[PDB]
């Protein structure tokens, strides 16, 4: 059960059908979907000639960003500079402490797994743990 | 009969004919249209003296 302010304000109204590609809250759970032949044409800008998004650059006289935007595309300088790179994700943040050259040119949201396979055994309740065991997700 | 609409007629369309009116009704009588201070419970809230 996701806990957020909008959860009380809005209502799911069951498994309602939305217009194609027009769900209100976008949750790209398929960003980390791997596809070798379609590596450059999945969750990425369609044209190779397009410039990098505005989110990859600093515009004004900034004082500092806690985390960079997900659409910011990983570049060589991200690994070469050896600086601190963080991306907001559940639960709190994901930090790039393993700079690799195999992710150059791909978006950080594509690199980061949205739906983490790991399940917390601590906050899980008795009934919820029983449900997970019945589903097979937990022993 | 019950009313079916409401119009803002300028009140000279339906006047009291002169022969059943007090004499000239202007200088002899001074008339002021004020409002009752008691509970009307239905009636002329704004009545003239």
């Amino acid at each position: 059960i996701a806990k957020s302010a909008f959860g009380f304000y809005l209502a799911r109204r069951g498994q309602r059908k939305y217009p194609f590609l027009r769900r209100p809250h976008i949750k790209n759970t398929h960003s980390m979907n791997p596809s070798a032949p379609y590596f450059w044409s999945f969750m990425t800008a369609k044209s190779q000639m397009a410039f990098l998004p505005e989110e990859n650059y600093i515009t004004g006289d900034w004082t500092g960003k806690f985390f960079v935007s997900k659409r910011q595309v990983y570049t060589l300088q991200h690994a070469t500079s050896g600086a601190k790179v963080r991306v907001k994700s559940f639960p709190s943040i994901f930090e790039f402490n393993s700079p690799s050259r195999w992710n150059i040119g791909k978006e950080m949201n594509t690199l980061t797994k949205p739906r983490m396979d790991l399940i917390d055994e601590q906050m899980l309740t008795k009934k919820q743990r029983l449900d997970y065991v019945r589903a097979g997700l937990l022993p | 009969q019950g009313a079916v609409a409401t119009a803002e007629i300028p009140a000279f369309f339906n006047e009291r004919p002169a022969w059943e009116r007090p004499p000239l009704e202007e200088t002899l009588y001074v008339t002021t249209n004020k409002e009752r201070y008691d509970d009307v419970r239905g009636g002329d809230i704004y009545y003239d003296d």
Binding site: - | G2, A3, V4, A5, T6, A7, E8, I9, P10
Partner: protein, 357 residues
């Protein structure tokens, strides 16, 4: 129903109720309305007229031959809405060196008026010697009989107001009705400049005389600028002229007095830098202007502020007051009876109850 109101124009239920016109009934105009014809308001604009000249005009009009002859000299003198930045001493020297040559009294007067206007625009106070050289001997001296042109007198007044000269009265008294009688032809800009100059100069009687003359000659108080009136009314300190100002302040309109108060407040507060010369502190006039604006403006209703300290009657609130005086009513009745004479006059009355405080 609910906190949100219902708009009757959009709601069809109200529009089709018995208190409005149903759609089945014929749709037609009822009781045609003429509001703009029975009583049409004059055009009063919140914003000032953008295309206004906003200055004193001199009505420059001479013979075309003289104008074209003096064109090389007149290029330096100000034209219609065009002000050259030539030094004032240059035009003064040109006039004092070429005026005897040209033989036309009217042309000389117009040229001197233009010289005065230029030196007033430049705020050059040295040009009064020109007036003493040329005009003083024949236009105003020991009972001078000459009739000066309106252009020249207006230009001289503008110059003296700009330079805050003390010689304006000798000309204004001649310009009263018993003399030249040029007062009705003075523009509201001229009146505003006179009032501002006198207020800056701090003349107690000048402001009174100018205001009385304006009222007599039907000068447009509303179109007279608020700042000049504020400066003129700031300088009055004497009791008699202060009373005159108090009784005269009712001539202005309600909007005019409200904006006079606004301008006075802002100028003596934040707008102190707007004036080149700071305004002197006159708290009496400031308070009276604020009070007069409050009197003239419509009075709103603030019940809590009005009746914050209101206390009910002793008899009315006796039940709700634990320690209240009730024998005071009996004492008042006894006093009333003694005054009436029913009781013996000045009879000794002893306290009827104990004093609980």
């Amino acid at each position: 129903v609910g906190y949100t109101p219902v708009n009757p124009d959009t709601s069809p239920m109200v529009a089709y109720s018995q208190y409005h016109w149903h759609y089945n009934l014929p749709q037609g105009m009822e009781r045609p309305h003429s509001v703009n014809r029975t009583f049409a308001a004059p055009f009063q604009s919140n914003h000032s007229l953008v295309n206004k000249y906003r200055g004193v005009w001199i009505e420059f009009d001479m013979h075309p031959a003289f104008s074209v002859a003096l064109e090389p000299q007149l290029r330096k003198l100000p034209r219609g809405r065009t002000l050259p930045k030539t030094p004032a001493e240059e035009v003064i020297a040109d006039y004092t060196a070429l005026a005897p040559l040209v033989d036309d009294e009217k042309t000389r007067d117009l040229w001197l008026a233009k010289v005065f206007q230029h030196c007033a625009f430049q705020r050059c106070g040295g040009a009064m010697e020109l007036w003493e050289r040329y005009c003083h001997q024949r236009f105003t001296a020991e009972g001078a009989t000459a009739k000066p042109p309106l252009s020249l007198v207006k230009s001289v007044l503008f110059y003296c107001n700009k330079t805050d000269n003390s010689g304006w009265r000798a000309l204004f008294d001649r310009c009263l009705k018993d003399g030249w009688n040029y007062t009705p032809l003075f523009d509201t800009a001229q009146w505003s400049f006179m009032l501002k100059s006198i207020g800056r100069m701090g003349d107690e009687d000048g402001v009174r005389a100018v205001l009385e003359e304006m009222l007599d000659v039907q000068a447009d108080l509303d179109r007279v600028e608020a700042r000049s009136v504020v400066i003129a009314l700031n300088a009055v300190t004497n009791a008699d002229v202060y009373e005159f100002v108090k009784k005269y302040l009712f001539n202005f309109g309600e909007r005019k007095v409200k904006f006079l108060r606004t301008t006075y407040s802002d100028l003596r507060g934040h707008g102190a830098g707007k004036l080149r010369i700071p305004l002197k502190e006159n708290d009496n006039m400031y308070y009276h202007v604020c009070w007069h604006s409050s009197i003239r403006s419509p009075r709103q209703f603030s019940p809590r502020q009005l009746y914050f300290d209101y206390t009910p009657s002793t008899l009315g609130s006796s039940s709700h007051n634990p320690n209240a005086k009730i024998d005071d009513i009996v004492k008042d009745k006894i006093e009333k009876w003694k005054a009436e004479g029913l009781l013996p006059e000045d009879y000794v009355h002893e306290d009827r109850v104990y004093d609980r405080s």
